[PDB]
């Protein structure tokens, strides 16, 4: 913690008096996830009958868990894009 002062002072002779050098941020020991199914992607993505665009089908989905892995492991999909979504953090995301 002394040598940092010489870098902040920018002088091999640090004259008398107190110098602010660095900051310490206590890092956290471990994570607490304190929550108080499966999501039908085999029923949506392997579904047998999609309607057209004039009467498109909409399925509100909640209260289940995301299988976001095999989405990327599918790799038979032509155009697959995401805006504001990260693949690594997709599992981490809690919609």
């Amino acid at each position: 913690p002394l040598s940092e002062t010489k870098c902040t002072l920018k002088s091999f002779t640090v004259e008398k008096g107190i110098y602010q050098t660095s900051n310490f941020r206590v890092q956290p020991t471990e994570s607490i996830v304190r929550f108080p199914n499966l999501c039908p992607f085999g029923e949506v993505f392997n579904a047998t009958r999609f309607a057209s665009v004039y009467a498109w089908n909409r399925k509100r989905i909640s209260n289940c868990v995301a299988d976001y892995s095999v989405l990327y492991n599918s790799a038979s999909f032509s155009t697959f894009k995401c805006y504001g979504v990260s693949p690594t953090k997709l599992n981490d995301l809690c919609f």
Binding site: L2, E15, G17, I18, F24, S31
Partner: protein, 164 residues
């Protein structure tokens, strides 16, 4: 580093006496920053708080005198770090002194450090001034019999380097 029902945050979770309304979720503060939370699996009111933070401060006599330094951790409690606890934070490497001398290297809240006694950086409550008590009585006057003429340099800026 906590996540409560999708709420994420990093703090010091403690017991707390503040009492929610039942339907509520987050307590908050004037800054809208998350303050208190309710543990979902068993309802209890947990505070939150910053980590130790503060700035590091290296108290040193001139490198001409010593290479020894006393580190002041500002505004922390001495755990997360010869140690001494101050008003201004956690000080390390300066031996406390019950004696009180002139403030020399100002630290905070009256704590002032100086190098002298072998030697070690010390830390002590600064004495403001030396003490005197005027000897006073309603008939008592003290008239100077002799004087000095002192020349005291006083120095002021006038102009600064002009630029364009």
């Amino acid at each position: 580093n906590f996540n409560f029902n999708g709420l994420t945050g990093t703090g010091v979770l403690t017991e707390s006496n503040k009492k929610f309304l039942p339907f509520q979720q987050f307590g908050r503060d004037i800054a809208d920053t998350t303050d208190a939370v309710r543990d979902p699996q068993t309802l209890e009111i947990l505070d939150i708080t910053p980590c130790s933070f503060g700035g590091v401060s290296v108290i040193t006599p001139g490198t001409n005198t010593s290479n020894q330094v006393a580190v002041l951790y500002q505004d922390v409690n001495c755990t997360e770090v010869n140690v001494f606890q101050t008003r201004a934070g956690c000080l390390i490497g300066a031996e406390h002194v019950n004696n009180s001398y002139e403030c020399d290297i100002p630290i905070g809240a009256g704590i002032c450090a100086s190098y002298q006694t072998s030697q070690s950086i010390i830390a002590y409550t600064m004495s403001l001034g030396a003490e005197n008590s005027v000897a006073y009585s309603n008939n008592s006057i003290a008239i100077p019999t002799n004087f000095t003429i002192s020349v005291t340099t006083e120095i002021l800026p006038v102009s600064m380097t002009k630029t364009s």
